[PDB]
Design a protein around this ligand. Sequence first.
Ligand SMILES: [Mg+2]
Ligand SMILES: [Mg+2]
Ligand SMILES: [Zn+2]
Ligand SMILES: [Zn+2]
Ligand SMILES: [Zn+2]
Ligand SMILES: [Zn+2]
Lengths: 162, 162
Amino acid sequence: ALTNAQILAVIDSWEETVGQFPVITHHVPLGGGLQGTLHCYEIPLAAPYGVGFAKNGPTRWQYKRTINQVVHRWGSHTVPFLLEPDNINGKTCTASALCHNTRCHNPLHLCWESLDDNKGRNWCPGPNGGCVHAVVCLRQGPLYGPGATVAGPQQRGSHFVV
Amino acid sequence: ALTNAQILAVIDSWEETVGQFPVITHHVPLGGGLQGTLHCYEIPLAAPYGVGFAKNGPTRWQYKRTINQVVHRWGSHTVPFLLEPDNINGKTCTASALCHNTRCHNPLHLCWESLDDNKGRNWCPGPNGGCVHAVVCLRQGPLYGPGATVAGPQQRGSHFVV
DNA sequence: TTGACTCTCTTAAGAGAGTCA
DNA sequence: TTGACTCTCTTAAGAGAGTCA
Ligand SMILES: [Mg+2]
Ligand SMILES: [Mg+2]
Ligand SMILES: [Zn+2]
Ligand SMILES: [Zn+2]
Ligand SMILES: [Zn+2]
Ligand SMILES: [Zn+2]
């Protein structure tokens, strides 16, 4: 809602509901050849999802609360950060999933940062492979690797230099 | 349609024209605190751009050639790879700017890979900072670094465990 | 045959708000 | 009030195709 006490109340009910989502253990690469364990609190695959939650997309949900007879709605992963600035250097802050598991709503697996910072974690070597993110990664990004480039830089003539 | 020989001719005329674009010297980070030099062949900011070139968007261009009365058009950065496979692992190949300078059309600064591989280079530590791309980056990604996260993983209660 | 404009679309990380019951 | 659906938009790396003289 608008007041501090009202925002805290929204975060508390959200945490309580999400706290009852089934907990699934995920073993993940940490980088450096090491492996770790994450406990994700996953929103159900189909309705009902939990008090206040509704699906607006294949893997998108929203949390709804009616405060003073007026309904308020937020992206399901954004609630933990309702008291933080919604922007940073003119860029919109976004709920970034450290566990790379969209169904997970564990706030201990989420951070609040620019979309660019958010995306970049997909290629991070991980907490044990060189991660330099100030708010450390929980695991190596799923896209980290040598890649599969079909063709590299090349020229037929001699008009260019690197 | 166009024979192998005709495609080669299109690549040759494209190189001839791009080679005459202003050549700008840029000093860039390579990772490991090292600085390097990259020479970008930059398409003009406004028309005319060069023979065969036209702007279809703020930072998008196309290359056009008419062969035997039929007009052919390609994304401006895609020409170097016309004789290469156009997909890999079920993913479309895209022109990936190793120099991270959109206006540049220097073929020695481009590679052909998936959009995910392409995007990830934005966060790479660089050829001198740990790059593991099989087709090595020319410089450290512009977005590499500690990031600027506003809020980290947190909970108000004790419903969660990482 | 060309140049200089016009328009909408793809991905995969993220969002907004409306219609019914 | 609360649930279960519907639709489209944003970002920044990338695209294809039409009009007119
Ligand atoms: Mg993410
Ligand atoms: Mg790129
Ligand atoms: Zn999780
Ligand atoms: Zn990281
Ligand atoms: Zn360049
Ligand atoms: Zn690299």
